[PDB]
Amino acid sequence: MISLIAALAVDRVIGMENAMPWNLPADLAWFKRNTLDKPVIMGRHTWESIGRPLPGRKNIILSSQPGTDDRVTWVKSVDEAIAACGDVPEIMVIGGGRVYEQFLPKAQKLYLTHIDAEVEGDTHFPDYEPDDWESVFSEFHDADAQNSHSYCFEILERR
Numbered sequence: 001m002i003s004l005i006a007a008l009a010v011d012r013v014i015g016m017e018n019a020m021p022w023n024l025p026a027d028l029a030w031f032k033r034n035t036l037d038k039p040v041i042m043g044r045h046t047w048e049s050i051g052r053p054l055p056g057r058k059n060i061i062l063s064s065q066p067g068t069d070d071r072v073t074w075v076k077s078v079d080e081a082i083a084a085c086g087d088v089p090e091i092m093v094i095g096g097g098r099v100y101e102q103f104l105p106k107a108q109k110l111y112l113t114h115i116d117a118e119v120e121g122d123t124h125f126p127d128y129e130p131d132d133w134e135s136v137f138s139e140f141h142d143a144d145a146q147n148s149h150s151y152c153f154e155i156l157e158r159r
């Protein structure tokens with residue numbers, strides 16, 4: 001089973017290359033808890049933004065270009081990425097936008113953090129249809145001394 005996990009600004013704007021304009025360690029904690037001990041599939045921009053292998057996860061980077069870090073696994077196609085994950089209960093696809101578009105048709109679950117941040121940009125999380133998905137968890141948090149913006153964790157399961 002393949003899941004996508006993403007942090008979305010208003011109107012589902014997501015990162016394209018430069019770091020997103022927020023400071024959300026609680027979102028990073030949610031990401032770490034929902035991805036640890038699972039293989040993670042990412043594109044090259046997300047890899048650069050992470051800046052290091054994510055510990056405790058097989059890191060798989062989908063890129064047309066040769067790999068530049070032997071600490072992680074480099075693949076050139078979607079099927080190669082899935083194969084590198086091997087036989088596990090859940091694959092976490094962690095972005096960026098082209099990777100989400102590639103994997104959404106295969107995915108059964110979305111972990112979304114909806115962030116109340118007005119971020120300008122043309123890159124968006126792919127369209128999902130409101131009703132093709134069951135929202136099974138939702139939990140709101142206000143901005144605080146450590147987190148710049150309010151944020152709502154949601155888990156959806158494909159109908």
Ligand SMILES: CN(Cc1cnc2nc(N)nc(N)c2n1)c1ccc(C(=O)N[C@@H](CCC(=O)NCCCCCCCCCNC(=O)CC[C@H](NC(=O)c2ccc(N(C)Cc3cnc4nc(N)nc(N)c4n3)cc2)C(=O)O)C(=O)O)cc1
Nearest residue numbers: 005006007027028029031032046049050054055094095113
């Ligand atoms: C891009 N992505 C992709 C991404 C992101 N989010 C997503 N979210 C979702 N939902 N989904 C996705 N797919 C998704 N993808 C991802 C995905 C995952 C991850 C990922 O890491 N994750 C880890 C978990 C976290 C972790 O483990 N993260 C990090 C791990 C390392 C932590 C160990 C600490 C080592 C020390 C290093 N320390 C430092 O550098 C700071 C230096 C230090 N200072 C401070 O500390 C400090 C602080 C506050 C301060 N202030 C307030 C007051 C202040 C401020 N600024 C000032 N500036 C000026 N001039 N003047 C001031 N007076 C001033 N005052 C002042 C000073 C020091 O002075 O010594 C993990 O998944 O294991 C990352 C990216």
Ligand SMILES: [Cl-]
Nearest residue numbers: 043045046096
């Ligand atoms: Cl990417």
